[PDB]
Structure 1
Amino acid sequence: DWEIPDGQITVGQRIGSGSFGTVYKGKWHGDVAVKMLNVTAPTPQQLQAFKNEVGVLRKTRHVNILLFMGYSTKPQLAIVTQWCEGSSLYHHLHIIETKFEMIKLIDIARQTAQGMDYLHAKSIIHRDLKSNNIFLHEDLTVKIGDFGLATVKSRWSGSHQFEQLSGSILWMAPEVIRMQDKNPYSFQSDVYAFGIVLYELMTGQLPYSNINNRDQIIFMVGRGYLSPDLSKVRSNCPKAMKRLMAECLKKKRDERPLFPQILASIELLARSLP
């Protein structure tokens, strides 16, 4: 039983609504991140599958993975993770426009495959890798949060959960867009996400920067008609780098590399670097 008593968390400032929760900064033996789940339908089959999933996430410990400090059911369904001091990658790249050095950009990507590999090594699909879920703890280290939790990234009607696209789609592999597969979420749907993250790093932009239509993107990426414009890669990005990004972005999921090989490519690219 990994639950926390009701009056243990000192819920504080409301911070923002994501693809599957609202986050409040909390207090609980130091600052925490309390995410109040949008599934407030604690089904009997759900509460045992989310209990099981918290079991796996609780024992995931890695320097590039956000600590999963447990959860709460009283008042309603909630989640307590480590509070990050410092802004998310998305805020750095796209809001503050932090002027990272070329080598540091690589190392952000290295530290991220670093963590994502641990996940896949412990047989965890992220499902929701995006730069909003990569924080830069003390600006140095990379921390990946918001992983797993499939049972609460969908809503339930009994013992069957319909998997809904929620939040932002820019990172969704095309098979995840379509939702036509069995489970379309896979180690390559994560790798594809990572590919978009690389695009952010190499270009300083989100993809499809020239399309102010959301549904257009959904249809076209799902149908294969649309993929990121890679010429937008900044002038001084390693040739070896651009190529790695295009492998992850392969439309057919089965041409995408796995993280064992991805992480290798980067460290090779890191070492050989003036």
Structure 2
Amino acid sequence: DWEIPDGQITVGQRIGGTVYKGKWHGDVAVKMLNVTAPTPQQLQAFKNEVGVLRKTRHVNILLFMGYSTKPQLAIVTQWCEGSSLYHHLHIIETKFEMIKLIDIARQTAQGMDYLHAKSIIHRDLKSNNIFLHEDLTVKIGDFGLATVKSRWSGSHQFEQLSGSILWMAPEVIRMQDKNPYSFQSDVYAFGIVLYELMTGQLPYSNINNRDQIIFMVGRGYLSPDLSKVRSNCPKAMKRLMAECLKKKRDERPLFPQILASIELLARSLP
């Protein structure tokens, strides 16, 4: 069991539910539900998020360490030194070599492959939730929207669409099915990550109308401008990016195939 008896955790600074840097057998990350009266909906959220993390043990999934109930509801995970991929790419504009960028792609794919293999759909994959730990190891985090595929189609029910729009697949945005999420929706998000990696910029930089992007992407009018990939981007990557980004979800590759594409690419340079 992974319940941390009350008192042991020592909450400190803040970063961005809400996330603090704390102390429990070393530096840890503590993610809390600030409030005082947890609604049974916030409760099932917590129960579910813990449920998913419990099933993960892989070097590219951020390490779940345990949870607390009594003070506030909280999830404890490893602390990371170093920044998110978002921060490297769009804030400090780190000048990674192309072999490194490919490797970040590779590791991110590795973590996703591992999740899908245990039937977890992350549902909130994006630059910010990909940490370059010690600048050397990709750890995928934030499992606040993560879910496990149910064998039965009627367990789903109603969930209000949430998430960052730049990484949402058209079918997710449209939100026409009972369950529009799939392994393939995660791939699309990873597709946008390839975009940030191979271009250095977020998609749709000329458009600043939030509702317009939701509407145009869901409709098929809008899609990332692949011409903006930097010139050192291997042709295989550009193709692989365009494939992950296909509008027809079933046309997207899954993570073993994505992993293979990147290995085969890697095999091609001296």
Consecutive unaligned residues of structure 1, counting only runs of 5 or more, are 16-20
Cα 1:69/1:76, change in 2 over 3 Å: same
Paired with 2:147 and 2:107, the residues of 1 have a C-alpha distance of 28
Any idea what the Cα deviations from partners look like across 1:138-162, whole Å, max 9, x if unmatched? Answer: 1111111113644799999999974
Q: Deviations over 1:33-72 (max 9, x none)?
A: 1112378764557646743552342231111110011222
Match of 2:4 in 1: 4
Q: How many residues align?
A: 269
Question: RMSD of the alignment, in Å?
Answer: 3.6
Deviation for aligned residue 1:74 = 2.1
1:246 to 239, 242, 248: 242
Q: Which runs of 5 or more residues in structure 2 are unaligned? A: none
Where 1:8 maps in the other structure, the secondary structure is: coil
- Cα–Cα, structure 1 residues 50 and 232, in superposed 2: closer, same or farther, change >3 Å? same
CA deviation after TM superposition for structure 1 residue 273, in Å: 1.7
Once the two structures are TM-superposed, the CA of residue 186 in structure 1 deviates from its matched residue by 1.1
- How far, CA to CA, are the matches of 1:177 and 1:266 in structure 2? 28
| Residues 160-202 of structure 1, C-alpha deviations (whole Å, 9 max, x = no match) | 9743343521111111112221111210110000000000000
> Are residues 156 and 54 of structure 1, via their aligned partners in 2, closer, same or farther at CA, if it must alter by over 3 Å?
farther
Residues 228-251 of structure 1: CA deviation (Å, up to 9, x unaligned): 010001011111110000111011
Question: Equivalent residue of 2:121, what SS?
Answer: coil
| TM-score scaled by length of structure 2 | 0.90
1:29 positional shift: 0.6
Alpha-carbon distance in structure 2 between the residues aligned to 1:204 and 1:39:
38
Once the 2 structures are TM-superposed, how far is the Cα of residue 2 of structure 1 from its aligned partner?
2.9
Percent identical pairs in the alignment equals 100
Which is worse superposed, 69-78 or 48-57? Answer: 48-57
Of residues 70-79 and 39-48 in structure 1, the stretch that sits farther from structure 2 once superposed is 39-48
**What secondary structure, in the 3-state scheme, does the structure 1 residue paired with 2:162 have?**
coil
* Alpha carbons 1:155, 1:163 under 8 Å: kept: no
CA distance in 2, matches of 1:198, 1:39: 37
Distance, in Å, in 1 between the alignment partners of 2:152 and 2:23 is 30
Deviation at 1:253, TM superposition (A): 1.1
Q: Counterparts of 2:240 and 2:156 in 1: how far apart (Å)?
A: 38
Asked if the contact 1:136/1:143 (under 8 Å) is kept, the reply is yes
What is the distance in 2 between the residues matched to 1:204 and 1:45?
Answer: 38
- Identify which of 139, 143, 148 aligns with 1:147: 143
3-state DSSP class of the match of 1:219? helix
- Is the alpha carbon distance of 1:48 and 1:209 closer, same or farther for their aligned partners in structure 2, counting shifts above 3 Å? closer
Q: Secondary structure at the match of 1:135?
A: strand
Q: Is the 8 A contact 1:154 1:161 kept in 2?
A: no
Between 183-192 and 173-182, the greater mean CA deviation after superposition: 173-182
Distance 1:123 1:175 in 2: 20
Structure 1 position 97, deviation (Å): 0.2
Residue 44 of structure 2 corresponds to which residue in structure 1?
A: 48
How far does the alpha carbon of each residue in 1:105-131 deviate from its partner, in whole angstroms, 9 at most, with x for none? Answer: 101101111111000111111101001
Separation in 1, partners of 2:8, 2:247: 46
Structure 2 residue aligned with 1:222? 218
CA 1:273–1:82 in 2, change beyond 3 Å: closer, same or farther?
A: same
CA distance in 2, matches of 1:156, 1:47: 23
Cα deviations across residues 75-109 of structure 1 (Å, max 9, x unaligned)? 22221111111000000000000000011110110
Cα–Cα, structure 1 residues 98 and 117, in superposed 2: closer, same or farther, change >3 Å?
same
Displacement after TM superposition at 1:136 (Å)? 0.7
Is the contact made by 1:43 and 1:158 (CA closer than 8 Å) also made in structure 2?
Answer: no
